[PDB]
């Protein structure tokens, strides 16, 4: 899974600043699979099996979907250092897992941890 909070726009209270973040495709369009088939750069077909180059294998070949998904994150300020203008607290976010460019369904990943920042 690509742990990330890209484009997070939390707007809750000082604690529980609920917000949503972008979850870009774990792999890019250029990324080529073992078969060589990929998005912007790839065969798009099962060159290995010429007779079956195009078939139900479509889900894996010529798909390479790189559409970005979304995830929710909540931040809370445990302490604030006004003199040093520094804030720290806990974060909790559930984001989709890698979809193998659409080959596999995504899986919810709940990531909990601590966050630190300097308000300057």
């Amino acid at each position: 899974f690509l742990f990330t909070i890209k484009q997070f726009d939390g707007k809750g209270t000082l604690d529980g600043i609920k917000g949503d973040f972008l979850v870009p495709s774990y792999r890019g369009s250029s990324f080529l699979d073992p078969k060589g088939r990929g998005g912007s750069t790839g065969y798009d077909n099962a060159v290995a099996l010429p007779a079956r180059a195009d078939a139900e294998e479509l889900l894996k070949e010529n798909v390479k979907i790189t559409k970005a998904l979304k995830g929710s994150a909540v931040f809370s300020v445990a302490k604030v250092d006004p003199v040093t203008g520094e804030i720290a607290g806990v974060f909790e976010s559930i984001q989709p897992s890698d979809t193998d460019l659409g080959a596999k369904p995504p899986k919810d990943i709940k990531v909990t941890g601590l966050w630190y920042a300097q308000l300057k």
Binding site: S25, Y26, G28, S29, G39, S40, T66, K67, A68
Partner: peptide, 9 residues
Amino acid sequence: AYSGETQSE
């Protein structure tokens, strides 16, 4: 030619 929607570039 690529038309796939992507934001991982």
